[PDB]
Amino acid sequence: SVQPNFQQDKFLGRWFSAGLASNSSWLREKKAALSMAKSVVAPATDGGLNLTSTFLRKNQCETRTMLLQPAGSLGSYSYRSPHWGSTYSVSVVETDYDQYALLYSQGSKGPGEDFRMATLYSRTQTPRAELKEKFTAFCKAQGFTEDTIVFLPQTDKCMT
Numbered sequence: 001s002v003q004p005n006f007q008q009d010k011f012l013g014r015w016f017s018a019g020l021a022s023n024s025s026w027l028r029e030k031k032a033a034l035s036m037a038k039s040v041v042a043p044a045t046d047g048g049l050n051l052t053s054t055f056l057r058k059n060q061c062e063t064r065t066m067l068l069q070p071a072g073s074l075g076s077y078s079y080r081s082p083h084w085g086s087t088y089s090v091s092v093v094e095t096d097y098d099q100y101a102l103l104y105s106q107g108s109k110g111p112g113e114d115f116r117m118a119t120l121y122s123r124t125q126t127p128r129a130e131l132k133e134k135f136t137a138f139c140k141a142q143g144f145t146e147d148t149i150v151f152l153p154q155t156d157k158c159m160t
């Protein structure tokens with residue numbers, strides 16, 4: 001479920017995408033060949049969030065923004081992907097705002113319906129070991145097997 005009493009304004013700002021788990025081998029593999037720089041969460045004009053990730057793909061920097069539209073309880077969003085012809089729920093299921101957040105995404109419509117992913121965001125680029133465990137704990141509870149849980153390579157290229 002969503003983080004109780006979720007406060008969007010405290011989730012804003014700079015995060016690092018430190019880990020992910022997913023039932024898509026392809027997505028995990030594609031992501032692990034990228035080197036992650038910052039993600040930034042900024043308010044969207046629709047009352048939701050823009051989630052922008054900066055990353056290195058074949059030694060070249062790229063940025064991608066996902067619009068997370070408000071969907072259910074505070075902390076629950078939906079992301080519509082024209083490229084995948086699918087929509088996906090995205091929820092901040094646990095966070096303490098000042099060190100970590102766990103996001104859980106599931107396909108809700110379209111061929112992406114079966115996709116599931118958990119992401120660990122950390123306010124620091126190397127998460128303390130406590131936070132890795134909070135992530136791997138959650139992934140296990142949600143039925144991700146140990147080889148689908150991966151920690152993502154990081155870089156300081158692509159920023160400033």
Ligand SMILES: CCCCCCCC/C=C/CCCCCCCC(=O)O
Pocket residue numbers: 017020027030031034036053054055064119
């Ligand atoms: C939460 C997973 C993303 C971790 C940040 C990595 C995103 C930056 C690069 C991703 C582009 C390549 C992956 C293609 C599908 C996107 C999946 C997604 O962004 O949720």
Ligand SMILES: CCCCCCCCCCCCCCCC(=O)O
Pocket residue numbers: 024026027051053066079081084088090105112114115117119
């Ligand atoms: C980067 C923020 C994470 C938020 C989650 C958004 C979901 C991403 C959409 C990409 C779809 C992945 C498709 C591979 C799954 C499959 O084909 O089975």
